[PDB]
Assembly symmetry: D2
Homo-oligomer: 232 residues x 4
């Protein structure tokens, strides 16, 4: 059972398992039920931009989500990630659709990791090549002709499908801590396009971190964002 | 048969297959016989520092090697790497020993890759963890307790062994070009410690680039620097 | 460049690169141009059955192809496979379509390997599971709902597409020889269904053997049966 | 957390976690505490021979262990393995040493798997090649010059070391059941040589079956036989 730290743009309120009454960004520490959430002023059809940061000195995983010239949405959570995640991990983006759907388009994805014990891993994508050998595409994750990472299924038309799960891991494992390490930090940006024919888009996109061999958990569809085998 | 672009710190003169009469840095385009070389003022026992750069606009692979406060050694070569290397590659460091030996210690290794079509892959190591999951260690390559990448065999004493070959690839494939790409560049630094009981150290260390599935070619020992199956 | 030993059911005559004037079974030793061929009495729409055998004592790779109660077609070739193939290999089935097409259905596939130095590897498939984890499916190779290995593309209708290449490797590398080995033999059976709307079906199906890391060579489509990067 | 079905030749009594008072063979269904055990008349220095069988109709995992012309030791357990193990698995041999040690030599290892829904996977080893590419060697598992699989560490002298863990998985995943399958069976033989300077040899050898991605669990040393992260 994978260890998971995710920042969720939870498109779909699932009150029956923790979610607030509304679209929200959440910080998930080994549970789909977010340790912290903020009301996310969704804007379907516009391009969102998530920034994620954290160092091991401040011990505060923080995420902001924004649209151009629009009021942003921040959510923080005091956590020491080296007590949660293994020493080595892989970073990725996941997204699902349930009975309700939405395009989970990733227009770009950067991520910087620093381990001053000064080791480092930076990577950024503004274009997603047809064959991304530096990405372990899991489930329904693919890349379209516009150089966009489609995390979840989308017809040739552009319409999103439902009951789809897909994630993109960066091929190289990251080293986010070492007993010796004085400070391990990481940042993570990505822009996304969420479009939906439904007035209740679902289910969400997330940037997560996990055991290197992390794979899509069975039953992880929909409100589970392809991160957990259950809702505990 | 792998495609190979390497920058060699050729410790050992092998005149009988191209090498100059002396220790030298070479730029190898799909051949152990360097398209360009410069006389390398070796300093066994001191820590060297190779810087490598190249963009696709200038089309000039250049490398400099230096010791602290000592006269450096530069070597350049006009080449268009996208006509040589495949679209996707893996970057690494190799080193061998023949009948003559030497420690092939890598104290650090950074590498930045930029694909403005602005995609990117940066990674740097000042410490090499006991288990580097973000490095495909090939052959005799291992990491010692001092956090140093030993490319080639070295007894517990510290003495180097001979007839050893070892390389370190970064786990993630790099994208160094795209038909669309306007400019693909990359830099690569690394510091090394070459020590030898022999007054004729051998055989050398190299930073190379290759087809992603690049592996140590049979017969690639010694003067082949674990890069080629032959000397053509 | 992979080492390849294949037994080809060459559906399509390609005279301009060696092929006989007619559909034929060929034995290919590191070349699409068969060292031996026999006239293959094709029967599109009926289920064929290839048996392949060889031991290192007799040094005779032999293949027979048959349809129920129909005159079979045998082809032999005296070769010592341990002088051709590496010590370790992977066994598989490949098939392509060019401008002309055909279904490349594999209804079953067994293979026995014996290394008396008595080591062994047997595997047989009468059903191909939706997710064959014990098969490295390459290119357009997939498995349909009838439990059939579709080597090459086929519409939902059942019509075959063209310019498609796909192979199925057995996940485990086989050990087909050892310097010590007294006798290494192997057999290989498989039944196939070739159907075509075209009166000139193309291009063929093959059981091949190759370096373990064998992958579909670029330009290997059509008359190359997804085995060679060229016709030499 | 891996799913594990093992047949243990538990060299070392660990009463404080279930073990009988004596060396024994056990059948472990997702727990180091055997669902069934029989008193194992150990014979250190002689070559043992374990036979394992099971089909899904009888639903009885059975194992026998024997030495030449010596009273054997049988242990059975009524279990339906398709309710325990995933649909796809990898089969292997594991062994550890704790504060007490012993050579865990595997002189041979066969295994037949049949899935009549008649699919099959057979493999046998009487010799273990220096580089067994068809074996995922985990931990301290290696192969010596006599063609023997040393599961656990052994000095050049031949003396076994302690606190060592090593397993050998067959490279190809096995298909041990399918919803459709009418009967899935498997057999598994292997001969072993257990030698110890200690009058209380430890800890044991096992043939196990697990989720394909099974790896040595942390803390699985000694009485855990490199199968479980704990003793529950
Ligand atoms: O796409 C959003 C969701 O759809 C499903 O839950 C549903 C939310 N509204 C519903 C209305 C009816 C039924 Br039945 C279901 Cl399962 C749901 C589920 O598939 C969820 O996993 C998911 O959160
Ligand atoms: O370590 C350096 C070299 O040693 C060998 O070549 C030798 C250079 N000096 C020699 C002197 C005698 C003999 Br025999 C040999 Cl092979 C050599 C070879 O093993 C080379 O590959 C290598 O370049
Ligand atoms: O499907 C069979 C074949 O089709 C092609 O060659 C053709 C055989 N008949 C033709 C007629 C016209 C043209 Br243009 C072509 Cl390329 C061909 C090629 O694509 C071949 O690789 C292949 O053997
Ligand atoms: O090799 C056998 C065993 O050695 C250890 O347990 C010991 C059995 N006898 C002992 C006596 C003292 C101490 Br401290 C220990 Cl840990 C043990 C442990 O390391 C066990 O995992 C193992 O079963
Ligand atoms: Ca939700
Ligand atoms: Ca040289
Ligand atoms: Ca042909
Ligand atoms: Ca025990
Ligand atoms: Mn939520
Ligand atoms: Mn040189
Ligand atoms: Mn032919
Ligand atoms: Mn026990």
């Amino acid at each position: 059972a994978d260890t998971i730290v995710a920042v969720e743009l939870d498109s779909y309120p699932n009150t029956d398992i923790g979610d607030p009454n509304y679209p929200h960004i959440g910080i998930d520490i080994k549970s789909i039920r977010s340790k912290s959430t903020a009301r996310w002023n969704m804007q379907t059809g516009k391009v969102g931009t998530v920034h994620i940061s954290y160092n091991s000195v401040a011990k505060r995983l923080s995420a902001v989500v924004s649209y151009s010239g629009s009021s942003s949405t921040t959510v923080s959570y005091d956590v020491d990630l080296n007590n949660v995640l293994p020493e080595w991990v892989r970073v990725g983006l996941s997204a699902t659709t349930g009975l309700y759907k939405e395009t989970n388009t990733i227009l770009s994805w950067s991520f910087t990791s620093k381990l001053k014990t000064e080791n480092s891993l930076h990577f950024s994508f503004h274009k997603f090549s047809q064959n991304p050998k530096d990405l372990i595409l899991q489930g329904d994750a693919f890349t379209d002709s516009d150089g966009n990472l489609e995390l979840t299924k989308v017809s040739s038309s552009g319409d999103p499908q439902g009951n789809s799960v897909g994630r993109a891991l960066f091929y190289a494992p990251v080293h986010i801590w070492e007993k010796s390490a004085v400070v391990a930090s990481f940042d993570a940006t990505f822009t996304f396009l969420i479009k939906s024919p439904d007035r209740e888009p679902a289910d969400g996109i997330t940037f997560f971190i996990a055991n290197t061999d992390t794979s899509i958990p069975s039953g992880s569809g929909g409100r589970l964002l392809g991160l957990f085998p259950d809702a505990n």
